[PDB]
Amino acid sequence: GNPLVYLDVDANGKPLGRVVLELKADVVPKTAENFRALCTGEKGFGYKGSTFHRVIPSFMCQAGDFTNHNGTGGKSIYGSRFPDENFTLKHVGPGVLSMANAGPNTNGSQFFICTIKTDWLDGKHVVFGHVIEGMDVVKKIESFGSKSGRTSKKIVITDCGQLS
Ligand SMILES: O=C(NCc1ccc2c(c1)[C@H]1C[C@@H](N2)[C@H](O)CO1)N[C@H](C(=O)N1CCCN1c1ccccc1Br)c1ccccc1
């Protein structure tokens, strides 16, 4: 089966709700497993406590840099980086879950949730899941962003984990 995971997100201490994500282990098992483990923190590090450091309305909300907290860092459960698994899943619309990178084969822990169809990223960013529930939460996060990516409130993953 495919993992169901969750992120509980707050803005300046105040809760915004939960985002439930399906991880497509059936298509990208290595990428799904990385994200899953980072949600439970079972390796001793993960997304808990880290921020949505970059939010661009009508594009995406980006998170996952739990080492540098500014978009330069993050790491995977396999090491500092791992290859692009495949590009089978596409950026088809809002709610798509996909990996940030710094060029080919530089996946770590940073990721983003699309708020529109970002199909110009097809073949360059590995899509590995989608929002099952809580798109309204994602819209709340989005509303605190700006075209520059800076947020007007600190958007934090207070908790995360696995539902099944
Ligand atoms: O934020 C990053 N890169 C930082 C990063 C990402 C991953 C890792 C590391 C560092 C570290 C640690 C580990 N992994 C490896 O060791 C490598 O070094 N990349 C942007 C991006 O991916 N997207 C997707 C959603 C936002 N974004 C985006 C795309 C197109 C247009 C505008 C934007 Br805005 C970008 C920005 C601009 C162009 C291309 C990519």
Residue numbers in the entry: 2 to 165
The authors write:
4 Compound 18d complexed to CypD with key interactions highlighted. The RHS interactions between the ligand and protein appear to be preserved from the aniline series. Structural insights from the crystal structure of 18d revealed an expanded S2 pocket that accommodates extra stabilizing interactions, specifically hydrogen bonding and hydrophobic contacts, which likely account for the observed potency enhancement. Additional analogues 18d and 18e, incorporating phenylglycine, were compared to their parent aniline and glycan-glycine counterparts (13 and 18c, respectively). These showed slightly reduced potency, indicating that the benefits of phenylglycine and glycan-fused LHS are not synergistic. However, incorporation of glycan into the phenylglycine analogue 13 to give 18d gave a 2-fold decrease in K d. The situation is different when comparing the molecules with phenylglycine; the aniline compound 13 binds more strongly, with a higher inhibitory effect, than the glycan equivalent, 18d. In this pair, although the enthalpic gain conforms to the other glycan molecules, this is negated by a decrease in ΔS for 18d (unlike an increase in ΔS on binding 13), leading to an overall decrease in ΔG and lower affinity. Notably, compounds 18d and 18f provided significantly superior protection at 300 nM compared to that of CsA, with 18f being the most effective.
